[PDB]
Design goal:
This is part of a larger assembly, with chains A (148 residues) and B (59 residues). Chain A has 148 residues and is mainly alpha-helical. Chain A has six helices and four strands. The chains are: A mainly alpha (148), B mainly alpha (59). Chain B: It is found in: Mitochondrion inner membrane.
Chain lengths: 148, 59
Amino acid sequence: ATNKLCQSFQTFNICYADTGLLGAHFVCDHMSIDDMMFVLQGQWMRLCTSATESEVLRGKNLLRNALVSHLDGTTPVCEDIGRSLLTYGRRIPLAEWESRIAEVDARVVREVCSKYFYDQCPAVAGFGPIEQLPDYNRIRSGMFWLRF
Amino acid sequence: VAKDVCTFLRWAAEPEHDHRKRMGLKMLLMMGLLLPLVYAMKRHKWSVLKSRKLAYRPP
């Protein structure tokens, strides 16, 4: 926001059966792609190596709030029933989600993130004025820190 | 007598001879190790580019 790096971004975690896509999408100025990548990958590394209790508490609280208010009215609830039965084999009640969320502390976020993010080869897709979009080797080297 | 004195005069002119050659062997071996390793590191990094395919897709 302060440096006007991007116009937008989101983290995602797309789930499929035995696999998925965990990362982020961003839309930015043609001169900002390298900087966006650097800050984004920097965040991945910081969570892997050194996530704090209070910020994980914030993340927990976001997620608690996210899935409690998404299931508002009959359509989203109907869909949650429909798809949960396909994917999990059951509807997972909100009380169970809460138990899984309370279980997560700073130590967990580190260990879990390090599994999927740290020193792992990503998939990159770029479209548009992508002259700046970092070289794959530079992106891949951006998946570790020389300290931890 | 000539063979011996020459061997001495060789050492006179070049005392380093034996050390020099000891270093030579150790250099040849380390280079034997490091050159293909550094060459492998090279091909590894460059493999992103060696593999790549291009496609031209005008509207």
